[PDB]
CSV table of C-alpha atoms and ligand atoms in Angstrom, one decimal:
chain,number,residue,atom,x,y,z
A,10,UNK,CA,-9.4,-35.0,-1.9
A,11,UNK,CA,-11.5,-32.3,-2.7
A,12,UNK,CA,-15.4,-32.7,-3.6
A,13,UNK,CA,-17.9,-29.6,-3.4
A,14,UNK,CA,-18.9,-29.2,0.6
A,15,UNK,CA,-20.5,-27.1,2.9
A,16,UNK,CA,-19.5,-24.6,5.2
A,17,UNK,CA,-19.0,-26.1,8.9
A,18,UNK,CA,-21.0,-25.2,12.2
A,19,UNK,CA,-19.6,-22.6,13.9
A,20,UNK,CA,-17.7,-23.2,16.7
A,21,UNK,CA,-20.1,-24.6,20.2
A,22,UNK,CA,-18.1,-20.6,21.7
A,23,UNK,CA,-16.8,-17.8,19.1
A,24,UNK,CA,-13.0,-17.9,19.4
A,25,UNK,CA,-13.4,-14.2,18.9
A,26,UNK,CA,-14.7,-13.5,22.3
A,27,UNK,CA,-12.5,-10.9,24.5
A,28,UNK,CA,-14.4,-11.7,28.0
A,29,UNK,CA,-14.6,-8.4,29.3
A,30,UNK,CA,-15.0,-4.2,27.9
A,31,UNK,CA,-15.8,-1.3,28.8
A,32,UNK,CA,-19.2,0.3,29.4
A,33,UNK,CA,-19.7,4.1,29.7
A,34,UNK,CA,-21.9,6.3,28.6
A,35,UNK,CA,-20.1,9.7,29.0
A,36,UNK,CA,-19.5,10.4,24.7
A,37,UNK,CA,-21.6,11.4,22.3
A,38,UNK,CA,-22.3,8.3,19.7
A,39,UNK,CA,-22.7,8.5,15.9
A,40,UNK,CA,-24.9,5.4,14.3
A,41,UNK,CA,-23.1,6.8,10.6
A,42,UNK,CA,-20.3,6.1,12.1
A,43,UNK,CA,-21.0,2.8,14.0
A,44,UNK,CA,-22.3,1.6,11.0
A,45,UNK,CA,-18.6,2.6,8.9
A,46,UNK,CA,-16.9,0.6,11.9
A,47,UNK,CA,-19.2,-2.6,11.3
A,48,UNK,CA,-19.8,-2.8,7.2
A,49,UNK,CA,-21.2,-6.3,7.6
A,50,UNK,CA,-23.4,-5.7,9.2
A,51,UNK,CA,-26.5,-5.2,6.6
A,52,UNK,CA,-29.8,-3.3,6.4
A,53,UNK,CA,-32.3,-4.2,9.2
A,54,UNK,CA,-29.7,-4.9,11.5
A,55,UNK,CA,-29.0,-8.1,9.9
A,56,UNK,CA,-25.9,-10.0,10.5
A,57,UNK,CA,-24.3,-13.7,9.9
A,58,UNK,CA,-20.8,-15.3,9.4
A,59,UNK,CA,-18.9,-15.3,6.5
A,60,UNK,CA,-17.2,-18.5,6.8
A,61,UNK,CA,-19.4,-20.6,9.3
A,62,UNK,CA,-23.2,-21.6,9.9
A,63,UNK,CA,-24.5,-20.5,13.0
A,64,UNK,CA,-27.7,-22.5,14.5
A,65,UNK,CA,-27.9,-19.2,16.8
A,66,UNK,CA,-31.1,-17.4,14.5
A,67,UNK,CA,-32.4,-15.0,16.6
A,68,UNK,CA,-34.3,-11.4,16.6
A,69,UNK,CA,-33.2,-9.6,19.6
A,70,UNK,CA,-36.1,-8.1,20.5
A,71,UNK,CA,-35.8,-4.0,21.9
A,72,UNK,CA,-39.5,-2.5,23.3
A,73,UNK,CA,-39.1,0.7,22.7
A,74,UNK,CA,-40.2,4.2,23.1
A,75,UNK,CA,-38.6,8.1,22.7
A,76,UNK,CA,-34.9,6.2,24.5
A,77,UNK,CA,-33.2,7.3,21.6
A,78,UNK,CA,-29.8,8.0,22.7
A,79,UNK,CA,-30.6,5.1,25.1
A,80,UNK,CA,-31.0,3.4,21.3
A,81,UNK,CA,-27.4,4.5,20.4
A,82,UNK,CA,-24.9,3.4,23.0
A,83,UNK,CA,-27.4,-0.5,22.9
A,84,UNK,CA,-26.5,-0.2,18.3
A,85,UNK,CA,-22.0,1.3,19.9
A,86,UNK,CA,-21.9,-2.4,22.0
A,87,UNK,CA,-24.2,-4.8,21.0
A,88,UNK,CA,-23.9,-5.0,17.4
A,89,UNK,CA,-19.6,-5.4,17.9
A,90,UNK,CA,-20.7,-8.4,19.9
A,91,UNK,CA,-22.4,-9.6,18.4
A,92,UNK,CA,-20.8,-9.9,16.0
A,93,UNK,CA,-17.7,-12.1,17.7
A,94,UNK,CA,-20.9,-14.4,19.0
A,95,UNK,CA,-21.2,-16.3,15.7
A,96,UNK,CA,-24.8,-15.1,16.0
A,97,UNK,CA,-27.2,-15.3,13.2
A,98,UNK,CA,-29.4,-11.9,14.4
A,99,UNK,CA,-31.7,-9.3,13.1
A,100,UNK,CA,-32.5,-6.0,15.5
A,101,UNK,CA,-36.4,-5.2,16.1
A,102,UNK,CA,-37.0,-2.4,18.5
A,103,UNK,CA,-40.3,-2.1,19.1
A,104,UNK,CA,-41.8,1.5,18.9
A,105,UNK,CA,-45.0,2.7,20.8
A,106,UNK,CA,-46.5,4.9,19.1
A,107,UNK,CA,-49.3,6.9,21.0
A,108,UNK,CA,-48.6,8.6,24.6
A,109,UNK,CA,-51.4,5.3,27.0
A,110,UNK,CA,-48.9,3.3,29.1
A,111,UNK,CA,-46.0,1.9,28.3
A,112,UNK,CA,-46.0,-2.0,28.4
A,113,UNK,CA,-43.9,-3.8,28.0
A,114,UNK,CA,-44.9,-7.1,27.4
A,115,UNK,CA,-46.6,-6.7,24.8
A,116,UNK,CA,-44.1,-4.3,23.0
A,117,UNK,CA,-41.6,-8.0,23.0
A,118,UNK,CA,-45.3,-10.2,22.1
A,119,UNK,CA,-45.3,-8.2,19.5
A,120,UNK,CA,-41.9,-8.6,18.2
A,121,UNK,CA,-42.1,-12.0,18.5
A,122,UNK,CA,-44.7,-12.2,16.1
A,123,UNK,CA,-43.3,-9.2,13.6
A,124,UNK,CA,-39.7,-10.9,13.0
A,125,UNK,CA,-40.7,-14.3,12.1
A,126,UNK,CA,-42.2,-12.7,8.9
A,127,UNK,CA,-38.8,-11.7,8.3
A,128,UNK,CA,-37.5,-14.5,8.3
A,129,UNK,CA,-37.4,-17.9,10.6
A,130,UNK,CA,-36.2,-17.6,13.4
A,131,UNK,CA,-35.6,-19.8,16.2
A,132,UNK,CA,-34.5,-18.1,19.5
A,133,UNK,CA,-35.9,-14.9,20.7
A,134,UNK,CA,-33.9,-12.3,23.2
A,135,UNK,CA,-35.8,-9.5,24.8
A,136,UNK,CA,-33.9,-6.9,25.7
A,137,UNK,CA,-34.8,-3.0,27.5
A,138,UNK,CA,-33.2,-1.1,26.1
A,139,UNK,CA,-30.9,0.2,28.3
A,140,UNK,CA,-29.0,-2.8,29.4
A,141,UNK,CA,-25.7,-3.2,28.0
A,142,UNK,CA,-23.2,-6.6,28.6
A,143,UNK,CA,-19.8,-6.5,30.5
A,144,UNK,CA,-18.1,-9.4,29.0
A,145,UNK,CA,-18.9,-11.1,25.5
A,146,UNK,CA,-19.1,-14.8,26.7
A,147,UNK,CA,-22.4,-14.0,27.9
A,148,UNK,CA,-24.6,-16.0,24.7
A,149,UNK,CA,-26.6,-13.5,23.5
A,150,UNK,CA,-28.8,-17.1,22.3
A,151,UNK,CA,-31.2,-19.9,23.0
A,152,UNK,CA,-30.1,-23.2,25.7
A,153,UNK,CA,-32.2,-26.4,26.4
A,154,UNK,CA,-34.2,-23.9,29.0
A,155,UNK,CA,-34.7,-20.0,29.1
A,156,UNK,CA,-32.1,-18.2,29.1
A,157,UNK,CA,-31.7,-15.5,32.2
A,158,UNK,CA,-28.4,-12.8,30.8
A,159,UNK,CA,-28.6,-9.8,32.6
A,160,UNK,CA,-28.3,-12.1,35.3
A,161,UNK,CA,-26.2,-9.8,38.1
A,162,UNK,CA,-27.0,-6.2,37.2
A,163,UNK,CA,-25.1,-3.2,38.5
A,164,UNK,CA,-28.1,-1.7,39.3
A,165,UNK,CA,-29.1,-4.5,41.7
A,166,UNK,CA,-25.8,-4.8,43.6
A,167,UNK,CA,-24.2,-7.5,40.4
A,168,UNK,CA,-27.0,-9.7,42.3
A,169,UNK,CA,-29.6,-11.8,41.1
A,170,UNK,CA,-32.6,-9.8,42.8
A,171,UNK,CA,-34.3,-12.7,43.5
A,172,UNK,CA,-34.2,-16.5,42.3
A,173,UNK,CA,-36.9,-16.9,40.1
A,174,UNK,CA,-36.1,-12.8,39.1
A,175,UNK,CA,-36.5,-13.3,34.9
A,176,UNK,CA,-35.8,-9.3,34.0
A,177,UNK,CA,-34.0,-7.0,32.2
A,178,UNK,CA,-32.9,-9.4,29.3
A,179,UNK,CA,-34.1,-12.5,28.5
A,180,UNK,CA,-34.0,-15.5,25.9
A,181,UNK,CA,-36.6,-18.2,24.7
A,182,UNK,CA,-36.4,-20.5,21.9
A,183,UNK,CA,-39.5,-20.3,19.4
A,184,UNK,CA,-40.3,-23.7,21.0
A,185,UNK,CA,-40.3,-22.0,25.1
A,186,UNK,CA,-41.9,-19.4,23.8
A,187,UNK,CA,-44.9,-20.8,22.0
A,188,UNK,CA,-45.4,-23.3,24.8
A,189,UNK,CA,-46.5,-20.8,27.4
A,190,UNK,CA,-48.1,-18.7,24.8
A,191,UNK,CA,-45.9,-15.9,25.1
A,192,UNK,CA,-46.3,-13.1,27.2
A,193,UNK,CA,-49.0,-11.8,29.1
A,194,UNK,CA,-51.0,-9.0,27.2
A,195,UNK,CA,-52.3,-6.7,30.2
A,196,UNK,CA,-49.2,-5.2,32.1
A,197,UNK,CA,-50.1,-1.7,31.6
A,198,UNK,CA,-47.0,-0.3,33.3
A,199,UNK,CA,-48.7,-2.7,36.8
A,200,UNK,CA,-45.2,-4.2,36.8
A,201,UNK,CA,-44.8,-8.4,37.6
A,202,UNK,CA,-44.6,-9.4,34.1
A,203,UNK,CA,-41.3,-10.9,34.6
A,204,UNK,CA,-42.6,-12.6,37.8
A,205,UNK,CA,-46.0,-14.3,35.0
A,206,UNK,CA,-43.3,-14.8,32.4
A,207,UNK,CA,-41.8,-17.1,35.1
A,208,UNK,CA,-44.9,-18.4,36.2
A,209,UNK,CA,-45.6,-19.3,32.9
A,210,UNK,CA,-42.1,-21.2,32.1
A,211,UNK,CA,-42.5,-22.9,35.8
A,212,UNK,CA,-45.8,-24.3,35.2
A,213,UNK,CA,-44.8,-25.8,31.7
A,214,UNK,CA,-42.4,-27.8,34.1
A,215,UNK,CA,-39.1,-25.1,32.8
A,216,UNK,CA,-37.1,-23.9,34.5
A,217,UNK,CA,-34.7,-21.0,34.0
A,218,UNK,CA,-30.9,-21.0,32.6
A,219,UNK,CA,-28.2,-18.7,33.6
A,220,UNK,CA,-24.5,-17.7,32.3
A,221,UNK,CA,-21.8,-17.9,35.4
A,222,UNK,CA,-22.7,-14.4,37.5
A,223,UNK,CA,-19.1,-13.7,36.4
A,224,UNK,CA,-19.2,-12.9,32.7
A,225,UNK,CA,-23.2,-12.0,33.3
A,226,UNK,CA,-22.4,-8.9,34.6
A,227,UNK,CA,-24.6,-5.3,32.3
A,228,UNK,CA,-24.4,-2.1,33.5
A,229,UNK,CA,-27.7,-0.3,33.2
A,230,UNK,CA,-28.2,2.9,31.2
A,231,UNK,CA,-30.0,5.5,33.3
A,232,UNK,CA,-32.4,8.7,32.3
A,233,UNK,CA,-33.4,11.9,33.9
A,234,UNK,CA,-36.5,9.8,34.3
A,241,UNK,CA,-33.6,-4.2,44.6
A,242,UNK,CA,-37.3,-5.2,43.1
A,243,UNK,CA,-39.5,-7.9,44.8
A,244,UNK,CA,-41.1,-10.7,44.1
A,245,UNK,CA,-44.8,-10.1,42.9
A,246,UNK,CA,-47.4,-13.2,43.6
A,247,UNK,CA,-50.3,-13.9,40.6
A,248,UNK,CA,-48.8,-17.5,40.1
A,249,UNK,CA,-52.5,-18.4,40.3
A,250,UNK,CA,-53.3,-16.0,38.1
A,251,UNK,CA,-51.0,-16.8,35.9
A,252,UNK,CA,-52.4,-20.2,36.5
A,253,UNK,CA,-55.9,-19.2,35.2
A,254,UNK,CA,-55.2,-16.3,32.7
A,255,UNK,CA,-51.8,-17.5,30.9
A,256,UNK,CA,-53.6,-19.7,28.1
A,257,UNK,CA,-56.7,-17.3,26.9
A,258,UNK,CA,-53.6,-14.2,27.6
A,259,UNK,CA,-50.7,-14.1,25.3
A,260,UNK,CA,-50.0,-14.4,21.7
A,261,UNK,CA,-53.6,-16.3,20.9
A,262,UNK,CA,-54.5,-12.9,22.0
A,263,UNK,CA,-52.6,-10.0,20.6
A,264,UNK,CA,-53.8,-7.4,18.8
A,265,UNK,CA,-52.1,-4.4,17.6
A,266,UNK,CA,-51.6,-2.6,14.5
A,267,UNK,CA,-48.3,-1.6,12.7
A,268,UNK,CA,-48.3,2.0,11.2
A,269,UNK,CA,-44.6,2.1,10.2
A,270,UNK,CA,-42.3,0.3,9.5
A,271,UNK,CA,-38.1,1.7,8.7
A,272,UNK,CA,-34.8,-0.9,8.7
A,273,UNK,CA,-32.0,1.4,9.4
A,274,UNK,CA,-29.1,0.1,8.3
A,275,UNK,CA,-28.8,-1.2,12.1
A,276,UNK,CA,-31.5,-2.2,13.4
A,277,UNK,CA,-35.4,-2.2,11.8
A,278,UNK,CA,-37.8,-0.6,14.2
A,279,UNK,CA,-42.1,-1.4,14.0
A,280,UNK,CA,-44.0,1.6,15.1
A,281,UNK,CA,-46.8,-0.2,16.3
A,282,UNK,CA,-50.4,0.9,18.4
A,283,UNK,CA,-50.6,-1.6,20.9
A,284,UNK,CA,-53.9,-0.4,22.5
A,285,UNK,CA,-54.8,0.9,25.1
A,286,UNK,CA,-55.3,-0.8,29.3
A,287,UNK,CA,-59.0,-2.0,28.8
B,301,MN,MN1,-34.1,1.4,33.1
């Protein structure tokens, strides 16, 4: 019964998952130690199973600016999880250059476009750097519909702010992201960019996929520095096709590949 054969696809659900995890942010993290503890993660924070092929080719995009301690906790907790989930993944920290108002959604668009230059990713997880999953059955990859991953956040009492809430951590396949023309580029701290994204999905006929709440619990990291739904539905319809990936403009000032992640420093301009 011999002959040349391809590696099998990885199983529908990984047999390596452990379920609940204790998430704490009160101890120091040393990334050199984390790298040594995750020897299979390659330069730039890249990993893929050795014994099976994953259909999940995921770029994990993290909007960022001056929050190194949070990022260290993020890397410490997620790398082991992402490997147990048997994903073919890469970590991208999109660092906003300058001191102008932070623009989360625009940095996510940057991450989508830059990660694609590195590899043919077909799934994108957009994650704030201060959100950590409490259960590894919460899959960091894409589904038949846009996926909302951080569904029961401790900062919100482990309950969804509202059924249309799409903030924190989410995942869109390449097809899903492209069809909504990505995310809006003009929410300069205005708040509600996630609601605009939700409106884009609905308008294109998509719905929200969510893991069961029991495994969707996430912890939020506090920093020395419940949400309500913003409207702008009519604005989204009017603006989505002219404001997003197609109109995205930015300058890449630095690209650093570290053992556990790639950091792309970009100048995304100032509010126009
Ligand atoms: Mn926060």
